Design a protein around this ligand. Structure first.
Ligand SMILES: Nc1nc2c(ncn2[C@@H]2O[C@H](COP(=O)(O)OP(=O)(O)NP(=O)(O)O)[C@@H](O)[C@H]2O)c(=O)[nH]1
Lengths: 363, 277
């Protein structure tokens, strides 16, 4: 099964994002066969969305929609970068898109070679001003429309773009290849055997005899996996996506808690304070009816459990309404296993009123 | 006509690369004339954009003593609404509205039309000075909920913090009257007949329905009026109770929200791509 890559187009409303995406699908189908669009290259499967709005993209990046593995910045060669091109790239840095490829569109309408270089140079500099590697950035000179109409010379440029998607965007890491992690849901003691914790393996593989750390809420503890089982049948290993029970040596069941995480040693740490991008559900989405303020004291649901936290609103912000998305610094009342990019729900009285993503761990 | 000269004209105007070369070429290298020519060309570029729905943008507020202005300037995307050039334009319009006490949006539009056009020509989105309103009062305060909602509140006997809290309340709760007694008898009469009709068809006996609707009228006028609404920061009291507590009074308020009364265009990316395929 070929690797899945999430990409998106971003750029001016008239510079050809939709035409490009149509050209990509058409040319790739014509060559390789086969709300989002999907297309295939020989080695990869792509899922492609558009990013027409800033807040709209952030909200979807929070409420579940896949985060881009890479973005295609579409700039018409006739105009060059617009003033709002800064905002397009700034979104990229904000949501931490790791790679940006540039498609210079409408090159079928610009003769002067020296002007194309001025456009390219401006783009590379804008990119670099927001700490993307402008000098190393792939910049394809094409024509989406002419390619879409079947002009072979420009169809080649669509293929050139696909080539950079294949080579310049690193193969996304499969969950089973990441370091082992299992969110603990329940804990049982089995007299004669020992302690078993249950959960769904979030990533990696846990095998009998391997050491694990128990991370979050309490002091980190170490143990060894003395068995993995599913439906009362002993496995040799538990893999990412499987619901298993992991038998531990030495640990008593009073020493493990729901909300803790089993993990490959040294690979994840507990924290209490972080920066996040947060989205608050509107009333129609089943959220709060009323706004909240600086003393709001909700629960942050990480994987399997609530952790109460206090919040710091950005300067200049004293109120948060239902339907808003904002940045906030959160301080949990006790630590939880976390790293950048970890998603969470915001709850009150056990009811979800929002969602967020950890953007930067602080303490 | 060289790449350096084209680069200079683009550096001065922010106009598209090809528009710059075309303008410089017709001007035979004169930067100042190229600029003047783009004014002519720009008006038609703006005209082509004028049909585009501009439902994004900013609300801005500015207070000058006993006089305050609230302003809506629209664009097509929030990417442009965050842009420094768009921001400076909206700020400039805001400043002029305050300094000249300009409440007729057509006067405001007329003063800035050439600047608007120059801006549309470089940004490539429909931009529109949509509406403006003034509020006058003894004490004025404002609240901006991001760039999306703006509120002015006029008050009497109220300090800065109180005025601000009420403006925040107005931003969230959207009253359209100051007090329940401000709702006209005609409005209340119509609403009474609405509720009585609803109550009747639901099978409630006439004598019971009439008594229930009487209760709903007190609810109705309390809900659309500022002093009758529960205070968003402390909903166990109404804003009216809050004002009595501070020996204060609200004499006026205005709430703008970006895109109010503009039909949101529902876009389907996948479909629009499929169509082109
Ligand atoms: N010459 C040329 N024109 C192009 C190219 N790509 C797009 N265009 C033109 O520029 C415009 C881009 O349209 P696009 O933004 O993709 O779709 P859209 O959002 O529906 N545009 P609109 O709504 O304004 O028609 C279209 O008028 C299209 O014909 C290109 O590579 N070369």
């Amino acid at each position: 099964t070929k690797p899945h890559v999430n990409v998106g187009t971003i750029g001016h409303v008239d510079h050809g994002k939709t035409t490009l995406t149509a050209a990509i699908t058409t040319v790739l189908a014509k060559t390789y066969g086969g709300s989002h669009v999907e297309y295939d290259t020989p080695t990869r499967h792509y899922a492609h969305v558009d990013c027409p709005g800033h807040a709209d993209y952030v909200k979807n990046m929070i409420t579940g929609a896949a985060q881009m593995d890479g973005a295609i910045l579409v700039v018409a060669a006739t105009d060059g970068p617009m003033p709002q091109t800064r905002e397009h790239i700034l979104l990229g840095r904000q949501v931490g898109v790791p790679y940006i490829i540039v498609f210079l569109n409408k090159c079928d309408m610009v003769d002067d070679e020296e002007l194309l270089e001025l456009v390219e140079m401006e783009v590379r500099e804008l990119l670099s001003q927001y700490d993307f590697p402008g000098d190393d950035t792939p910049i394809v000179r094409g024509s989406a429309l002419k390619a879409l109409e079947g002009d072979a010379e420009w169809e080649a440029k669509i293929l050139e773009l696909a080539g950079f998607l294949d080579s310049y965007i690193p193969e996304p890491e499969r969950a089973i290849d990441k370091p082992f992690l299992l969110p603990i849901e329940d804990v049982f003691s089995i007299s004669g055997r020992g302690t078993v914790v249950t959960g769904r393996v979030e990533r990696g593989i846990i095998k009998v005899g391997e050491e694990v750390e128990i991370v979050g809420i309490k002091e980190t503890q170490k143990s060894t996996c003395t068995g993995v089982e599913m439906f009362r049948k002993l496995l040799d290993e538990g893999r990412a996506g499987e619901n298993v029970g992991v038998l531990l040596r030495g640990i008593k069941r009073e020493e493990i808690e729901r909300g803790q995480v089993l993990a490959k040693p040294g690979t994840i740490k507990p924290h209490t304070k972080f920066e996040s991008e947060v989205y608050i559900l509107s009333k129609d989405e089943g959220g709060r009816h009323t706004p909240f303020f600086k003393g709001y004291r909700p629960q942050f649901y990480f994987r399997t459990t609530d952790v109460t936290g206090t919040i710091e609103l950005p300067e200049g912000v004293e109120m948060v309404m239902p339907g808003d998305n904002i940045k906030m610094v959160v301080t949990l009342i006790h630590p939880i296993a976390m790293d950048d990019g970890l998603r969470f729900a915001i709850r009150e009285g056990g009811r979800t009123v929002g969602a967020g993503v950890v953007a930067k761990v602080l303490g | 006509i060289t790449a350096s000269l084209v680069k200079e004209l683009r550096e001065r105007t922010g106009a598209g690369m090809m528009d710059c070369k075309k303008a410089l070429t017709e001007a035979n290298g004169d930067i100042e004339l190229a600029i003047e020519n783009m004014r002519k060309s720009g008006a038609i570029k703006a005209a082509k954009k004028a049909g585009n729905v501009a439902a994004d943008g900013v609300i801005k507020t500015k207070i000058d003593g006993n006089y305050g202005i609230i302003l809506e300037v629209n664009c097509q995307t929030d990417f442009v609404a965050k842009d420094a050039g768009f921001q400076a334009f909206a700020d400039k319009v805001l400043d002029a509205a305050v300094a000249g006490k300009i409440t007729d949006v057509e006067v405001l539009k007329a003063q800035f039309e050439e600047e608007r056009v120059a801006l549309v020509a470089k940004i490539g989105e429909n931009i529109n000075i949509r509406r403006v309103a003034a509020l006058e009062g003894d004490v004025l305060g404002s609240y901006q909920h991001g760039a999306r909602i703006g509120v002015l509140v006029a008050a009497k006997g109220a300090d800065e913090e109180l005025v601000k809290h009420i403006a925040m309340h107005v931003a969230a709760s959207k009253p359209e009257f100051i007090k329940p007694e401000d709702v006209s008898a005609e409005v209340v009469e119509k609403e009474y007949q609405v509720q009585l009709d609803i109550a009747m068809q639901s099978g409630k006996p006439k004598e019971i329905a009439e008594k229930m609707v009487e209760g709903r009228m007190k609810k109705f006028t309390g809900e659309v009026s500022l002093t009758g609404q529960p205070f968003v920061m402390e909903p166990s009291k109404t804003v009216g109770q809050l004002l009595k507590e501070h020996n204060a009074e609200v004499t006026g308020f205005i709430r703008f929200e970006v895109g109010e009364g503009i039909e949101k265009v529902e876009t389907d990316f996948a479909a629009e791509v499929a169509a082109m395929s």
